Amino acid sequence: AGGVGVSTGDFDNTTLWDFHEDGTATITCNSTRLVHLTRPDSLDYKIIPTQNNTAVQTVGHMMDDDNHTQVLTPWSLVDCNAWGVWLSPHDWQHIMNIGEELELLSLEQEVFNVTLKTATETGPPESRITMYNNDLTAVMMITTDTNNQLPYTPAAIRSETLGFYPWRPTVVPRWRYYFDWDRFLSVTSSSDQSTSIINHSSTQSAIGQFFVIETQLPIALLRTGDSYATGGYKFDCNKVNLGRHWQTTRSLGLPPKIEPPTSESALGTINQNARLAWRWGINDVHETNVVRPCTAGYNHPEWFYTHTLEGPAIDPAPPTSIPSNWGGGTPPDTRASSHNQQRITYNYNHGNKDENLNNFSLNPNNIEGSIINQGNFLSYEGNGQQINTTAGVAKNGETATSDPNLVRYMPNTYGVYTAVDHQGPVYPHGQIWDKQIHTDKKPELHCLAPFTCKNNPPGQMFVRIAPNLTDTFNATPTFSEIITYADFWWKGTLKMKIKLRPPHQWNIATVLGAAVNIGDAARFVPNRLGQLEFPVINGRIVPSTVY
Amino acid sequence: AGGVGVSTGDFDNTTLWDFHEDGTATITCNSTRLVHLTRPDSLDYKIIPTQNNTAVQTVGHMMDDDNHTQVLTPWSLVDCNAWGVWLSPHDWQHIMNIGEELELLSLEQEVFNVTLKTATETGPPESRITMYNNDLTAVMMITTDTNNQLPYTPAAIRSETLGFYPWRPTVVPRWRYYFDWDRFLSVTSSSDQSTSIINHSSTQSAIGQFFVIETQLPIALLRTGDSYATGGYKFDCNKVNLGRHWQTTRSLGLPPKIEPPTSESALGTINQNARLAWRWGINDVHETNVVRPCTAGYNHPEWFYTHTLEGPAIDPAPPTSIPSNWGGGTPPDTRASSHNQQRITYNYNHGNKDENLNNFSLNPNNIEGSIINQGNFLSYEGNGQQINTTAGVAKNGETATSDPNLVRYMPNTYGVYTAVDHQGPVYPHGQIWDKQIHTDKKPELHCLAPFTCKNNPPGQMFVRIAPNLTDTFNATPTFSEIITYADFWWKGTLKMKIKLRPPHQWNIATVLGAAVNIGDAARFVPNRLGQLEFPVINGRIVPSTVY
Amino acid sequence: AGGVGVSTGDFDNTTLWDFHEDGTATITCNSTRLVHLTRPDSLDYKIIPTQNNTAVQTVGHMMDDDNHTQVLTPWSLVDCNAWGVWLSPHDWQHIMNIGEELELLSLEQEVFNVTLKTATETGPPESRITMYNNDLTAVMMITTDTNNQLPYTPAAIRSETLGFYPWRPTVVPRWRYYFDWDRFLSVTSSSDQSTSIINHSSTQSAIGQFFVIETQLPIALLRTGDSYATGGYKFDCNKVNLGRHWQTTRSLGLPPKIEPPTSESALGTINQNARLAWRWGINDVHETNVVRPCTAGYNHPEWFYTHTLEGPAIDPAPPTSIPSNWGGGTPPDTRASSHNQQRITYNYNHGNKDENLNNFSLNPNNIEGSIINQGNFLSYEGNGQQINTTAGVAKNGETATSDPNLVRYMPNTYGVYTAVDHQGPVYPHGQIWDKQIHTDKKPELHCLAPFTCKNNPPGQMFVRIAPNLTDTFNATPTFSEIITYADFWWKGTLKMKIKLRPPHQWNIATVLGAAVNIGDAARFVPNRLGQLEFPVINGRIVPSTVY
């Protein structure tokens, strides 16, 4: 509640830890940034189809298809769904190291200190200078979508979120959403000809839904002395496990009875006739046969692109760990990308060191569901006889080297016994929460965000600069204006609950330290010139038993 | 409560709409028909095996196998589970147009005005005439199965339901159920020989269960003045979504940052280095790569017949939309039936125009889970390099044209990220509700009925004519009788709740109108001669956002 | 209640639907726009006569007479009486599709965020630049006319209403009213000479009434922090029927007794001696003779221009449907405009696609009162004898081809038995309400607006910019000023009640859909370049029985 020269709101980027008697803590992490808003290019909405030329015009690249249809709005999106907005590299270490599981509690946010200004270039065409002046009666438009009537676009994907540096100002993107279209692109190989390609794209204007912010939801017109607050929100969603499960399918159970070695250089051995009980098939009991409570993880066709009614698209399995340094004894033959891995491309605003673009490919440390793909093999019989993959009188199976398509590349072993893990949070760039799709069958996991809202997610927040007109305006498709921009302050608070992990074991545990695992430590702190980069860190570190 | 000349019950086929303050309505739709019952052929039960000759005796047709074992009862089934029993073409339009979701509430039914009669042919063998007389002390037998001890046979499949014309009388079928058998039929191609076929069918009389209506459940003997009522029933089941989701996997999310076109004939373009954040694999961010909340729909082996311990049978995926008119730019190569489609064969009683048989193949308008099958392709690496399908030093994947069996015909991409939709109600012929199978793992959807009873479904209802004997009866396997038939009135009431869809968008929505979409409008209304046909209409029409 | 940097009021363009237990709903549709006001040209009032030259100076065109007298005020009119201000194309569809009748409830409106500014051109005459600055102590003048002392000018005619685009700013016109004059223009044909024309126009300054806003009604002087509100208003007027009556005079009643056809290609026939009862005149009973409850619609002289004491003017009958595509079998001979039709000319502000002007001629779908004019004929006797139109011993009548003037062009059949319908609402351009003329005999309908206020209508609203003076002012007829303009926000809320139509019939009804009836669907949604047009739609669509 202030005027021209009275400020609203304050800057709090701190974090807090409130411990409780029952062995849990509450983490209050609040964040505040200065945002730079700029006027839209056109007053109205646009439905514009787009495509990538090199994908449709060359035979082999159908995986490059960008062809779609979207609608631009004269509105900008204020989104903080990434981790790196809320908490620092030290906060991440501290949560992962002592944490067992965490859950979301509440979210609230507001804007204040709006301060619009105008820019006017003057002088001769040789020396042109712009002057800046507060326009005190100018208005900025702001609204939040509650009841979630608009399409839901998370901005953590595509890296549009508020910036990660607490001491720098930030930019917002312009909001947009898809509009219905039809697409078909034929499959072609490095053989044949480009005149054989058929691409079909048509925007469907009868079926599509066209939303406008103005008629959907109410808007607050706010001048310099005004502020806007959402009022508070309460999450309802699943808890997230912070421990890494080292166990695989093969490590679940009671291990067999063995004879211990007498010498330090020696191996244990399993005596024949010490092999007893349950297994799958007809064979002696071996570590491969043993009946176990469930299978961990599953095979999935990779990488397999599915052609929807609009465009090709990819069907992933959850991401899993890739063996990194196995001292020679590696999987000899591996592909460019192996276990469902994910990459991110980000820029300076999101924690790159400089104005260039940076790329990072994630390798999770989750060991459980991971499948070395070259070692799969099929056996027509369980009998435990030597495998013969040559075509003839004795053909008892096939191996991933024999028919790679059938075994290595396109198995699907999903079934009733399978159990999988979400790859967990990813810092700074990961998405915190996501709404659930509205369908008869729901998914069992989401591809990125660890949290899934059971009820409606927190509503999306939009801003724009109201038009500022000269004296000659007649209502016409095009008209002169006054160049105007706004800089406002954003503040938000996210509350989470964490339970503390008690010491579970005798030997010393592996935690998240400095100078080796993450990298050179000097690379994450400021420079002589003031430069640093945000460490890209994995969500789960301290091991735990899954069964 | 009436005698010989006092009627019981009344005719109400009307529908009602009761609106509520909270934006929902109650739909009371009740239906009444005159049913013609005829005496059974044999007094007793029969366990009769059957087969189709042309399937076992020719090499290539194993998909024609009709071979099974059933038991005939001297009882008829009164079933109204189809939509077309309850409500008119205008009621269907009105529900779909303004409706958002609907749920079932209650069901009740009764029979009245029983009126049995006898028929006796007399006269010379040249001119033979039959006379008709009320037999006032004759009895009709009626019972309903509550507690659901008998096998559950829905009659909407096989088209045995009460007729769809409000102004015509109806027929009931004779009730029957399966009895255990063993079956094996070997697979043979258009090559080789018919002496190579081996068909095995044996009814198993030790294991099978044999039910008789008389000893399972109590029966009401009712004369002309008598009536019978079930007493009312209350559904517990899932709600059904009435909107069509236009979105696919590829339309879910925030669309990319693009450069808008300057000209009306022009396309948007995605600038390099404007490509940021999350995706699957190692490549630049493209519409195919982008990480999305979930995958919509899944690949499934089609059409794949599985051989159970009795007979072959087919494993479907849910039905989805087939691209119809795409202006040339179609999927070039498509099969006789493509996306899990379903057909129905029906007759005059169920809304055909005349005494012939009619066939209709359903095409749903649900766009979401549909998969154009010819566009699938596999990539051994995510690197985004040109695809090479020729065998040699560089083989980076395969396409649906390269190995159609592996890619097009027999993929299974089901997994943790998948989400699907039920194809929704179908009018007039669709099944309204279904009981759930009693198993450790339940299904996630049912193949036809939109509603799944959590508790026991409404009990099935049976009728028969009691035997009417001449004077010479001694208890013997075969005996003379008096020819007798009954005509009774059936009445039922189904209550449903619907929530009203508020206007969600700016542009004009697509609703269900006349004269174009359905067809010629003159074809659905009576003729000079009194003839009409029931429009076959899809359940969901007004689009909505799934995410 | 705010100052320089404190905003007043908020932006709400949303619509709402509140359903009720009795089967009606309340529609709250509120609208908000940014208005650009500019300073008047002259401080004072003007009484200026005008004329069109080409009408008085050429023989044949007396229908082009523009000659009148008006008075300009230094005031602008803020009017929202058009439909297209309040609600979107989807709202229109939704009301017409499920609505039966609607009535008006209340109206309220206010202005806020006034922000005046000044413009000053500076620099050399080669490069002249204007600068813009807030003048914080400047005042805008605003008043509303309650008690309705001023002449009532609806602005929906002449297309002066606030614009139809929710996301664009708007312009207001300058208010003006008629001042008494005398006019006579002689009738002349394409024959004779222009020296025979006599035009007489004299403004009458003794009789005429001269109103000034300043002395009639009080005015509020408001600066930037000020706002103005009218306080609310309550309609009292007639209800409006939303259904289209398909029936004509000839379809009202019990149809005759006929013999049905045996064949599908065949026609029913009316047996002689099956013709019984009431009719008009002496003849057998035919569909033309039958006594009916009333006559629907009436003949009227068209097009007939009446010369008032000032100028010629036209006497319309209500507009009715024109047969469009009748497959050949059309009315062979039709005029440029046939059944009392109406056109509208509108510009970009009111929903044209671009800066050009657009024209649309309305064809109502109301079938009832429409009269095909070429088929009228007169019979001197009712006897049913063959009509003879040749002059001689047997002349029993005349036909529209025989004497078109007497029969086709100048009949008036209005009388005691006649019944007519208003053509209903028209979107976006139609007028919502109108005040009733103050006379001994009132009209039975109004030409455009569906609603007629019984009490006083809502008062008209006026704005102007107060004069902003330089330092040299002495009171003189002409003086220097400071160039000043204002941009204010307008907000209003209109409440309506609608009753919901229950399903009335068996066959599928015709509703308002997309892609065919209205036109190309892509034409009503934004473009690649952001362009769209407002569909011009008719008020009544779902048929209903008038009797």
Numbering used by the authors:
A (entry chain G), B (entry chain A), C (entry chain F): 19 to 565
From the paper:
The capsid also protects the genome enroute to the nucleus for uncoating and replication. This study determines the capsid structures of TuV and CuV using cryo-electron microscopy and image reconstruction (cryo-EM) at ~2.9 Å resolution and compares them to the recently determined structure of BuV and other protoparvoviruses toward functional annotation. The VP ORF encodes two overlapping structural proteins, VP1 and VP2, sixty copies of which assemble the T = 1 icosahedral capsid in an approximate 1:10 ratio, respectively. The individual VPs contain an eight-stranded (βB to βI) anti-parallel β-barrel motif, with the βBIDG sheet forming the interior surface of the capsid. The virus capsid plays a central role in the infection by the protoparvoviruses as it mediates the attachment of the virus to specific receptors on target cells.
Similarly, in 2014, TuV was detected in feces of a Tunisian child with unexplained diarrhea and TuV IgG in one child and one adult from Finland. However, one exception was the diffuse electron density observed for amino acids 533–534 exclusively in the TuV map located near the 2-fold depression where only weak density was present for the main chain at a sigma (σ) threshold of one preventing reliable placement of amino acid side chains. The less ordered state in this region of the TuV map could be the result of the presence of multiple smaller amino acids 531-GAAV-534 conferring flexibility to this loop. TuV exhibits the most extended 5-fold channel among the known capsid structures of all members of the Parvovirinae with a radial distance of ~135 Å from the center of the capsid. The extended channel in TuV is not the result of amino acid insertions in the loop, but is instead caused by a different structural configuration of the DE loops which runs more radially upright from the capsid surface, compared to MVMp where the apex of the loop is tilted. While clearly separated in the CuV capsid and completely merged into a single “spinwheel” in MVMp, the 3-fold protrusions in the TuV capsid displayed an intermediate phenotype, with the protrusion almost fused at the 3-fold axis. The intermediate phenotype seen in the TuV capsid is due to this loop being truncated by 6 amino acids compared to MVMp and adopting an alternate conformation. In TuV, both VR1 and VR3 display less variability to MVMp (local RMSD 1.6 – 2.2 Å) with no insertion or deletion in VR1 and a single amino acid deletion in VR3. The readouts from these arrays showed approximately the same average signal fluorescent intensity for both viruses with strong signals over background for TuV and weaker signals for CuV (~5-fold over background with large error bars). In the TuV array the 17 top glycan binders all represent SIA containing carbohydrates (14 highest are shown in Figure 6).
